[PDB]
Amino acid sequence: MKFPHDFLFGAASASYQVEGAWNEDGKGVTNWDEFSKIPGKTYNGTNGDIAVDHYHRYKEDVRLMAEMGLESYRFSISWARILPTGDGKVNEKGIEFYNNLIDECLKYGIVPFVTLYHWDLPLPLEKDGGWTNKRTAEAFVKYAETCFKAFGDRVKHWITFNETVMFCGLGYLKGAHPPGIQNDVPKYFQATHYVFYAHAKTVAVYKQLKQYGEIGITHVFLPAYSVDDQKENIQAANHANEYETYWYYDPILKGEYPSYVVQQLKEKGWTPNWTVEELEIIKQNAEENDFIGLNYYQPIRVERYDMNPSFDGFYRTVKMDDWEISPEGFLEGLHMLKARYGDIKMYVTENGLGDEDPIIDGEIVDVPRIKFIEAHLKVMKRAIEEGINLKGYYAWSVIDLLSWLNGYKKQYGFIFVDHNDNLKRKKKLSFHWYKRVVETRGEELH
């Protein structure tokens, strides 16, 4: 029974990706409801209108989780369900729905771990400039407090933000996510700052509520490596790590932003409009985080600009062989995080494989996914023996869901959803395997 009992095995979803019922029970419009209906933005013009219909089928879905012997379900609350316009009047039917989702998980002894913001911002607040406006950060702490008050007698594991890197990076640098802005780097760093503000402030609010759960943020964890032993390439990697780890992980865990990158934003005219009050709140609540969430998929191997580019030129990523796999990459990454942040408590809050799942006689035999998960689970076992403080694993995607960009195409998850048969669910091969892995508590030889 090798993983300890205070380690949770789980699976994850996000609201807009699974829920559907986009205009039901008083849900406000959100940024993604609008953005996905701009032609050419999303694969086949796919819609979060219905998604996988999880709103209406939640009792069913949680049953399947129960039958999986899932210990924890990580899901996201839709802000537009609780507070439709972002602030103002609370919507009692949003609270009714999430109370039911929570109570159902709980019937079966499944631990809700709630993500407050997984990219689905109510529209008014997007048009305010979203994360580039302090307003949106202040609206979020008010929203968070509403969820704590409503759900925190039962919910005792809370995530504020999923993957700030992406919703700021994709919306202001690459323009792939709303609001669709391209190479506006000062807005990007602004966005990240007001988010880190909203977080640390929300954490303060939570501790004041005396609910005695745990709270933390969940970042992309994209550990970066020099393509070889060359100094100029190792320099590129340090740079990579400064911008892609330290900028994200330092403000929340350490309470200070990292001076390397701060120096460079000043020297470029890219420093966000930040104030002492804000930076102090961030400073004062860094020690108040109970854990860090990691969304790990791959490392990145890098070489320098002269030697896929990074938003400041300087380095590029390169595919080669010493999308990427690398259990070795993930593990060294973990130690890299322990050296800097200490014995911080870690939840691998996403990890899994997107695929065109192989189908045989109507069965889904997703052995790539099993092999992906097994490999990472294996090195987490090593990591724990090597001292890392990992206390949970959340395979990205409990149930097939709507990709933001790629519609339905690259399945994620354990429960298959049948688009040809009224979105009927079916256990995949990974479902049966993971159930066994939970019951064995990860005894797959170590």
Author numbering: 1 to 307, 325 to 339, 347 to 470
Task: Give me lines lifted from the publication on this model.
In summary, we have characterized a novel PvGal-ase encoded by ORF1119 in Bacillus strain HMA207. The overall structure of ORF1119 was similar to those of other GH1 enzymes, which have a typical (β/α)8 barrel fold. The active site is located at the bottom of the pocket formed by loops of the barrel, a characteristic of most GH1 enzymes. The catalytic nucleophile (E374) and the catalytic acid/base (E163) residues of ORF1119 were conserved with other GH1 enzymes.
Structures of the ligand-free form and PvGal-bound form were determined at 2.5 Å and 2.45 Å resolution, respectively. The crystals belonged to space group P3221 and contained two protein molecules in the asymmetric unit. Because the structures of all four chains (chains A and B in both the ligand-free and complex forms) were almost the same (root mean square deviation for Cα atoms, <0.6 Å), below we describe chain A of the PvGal-bound form.
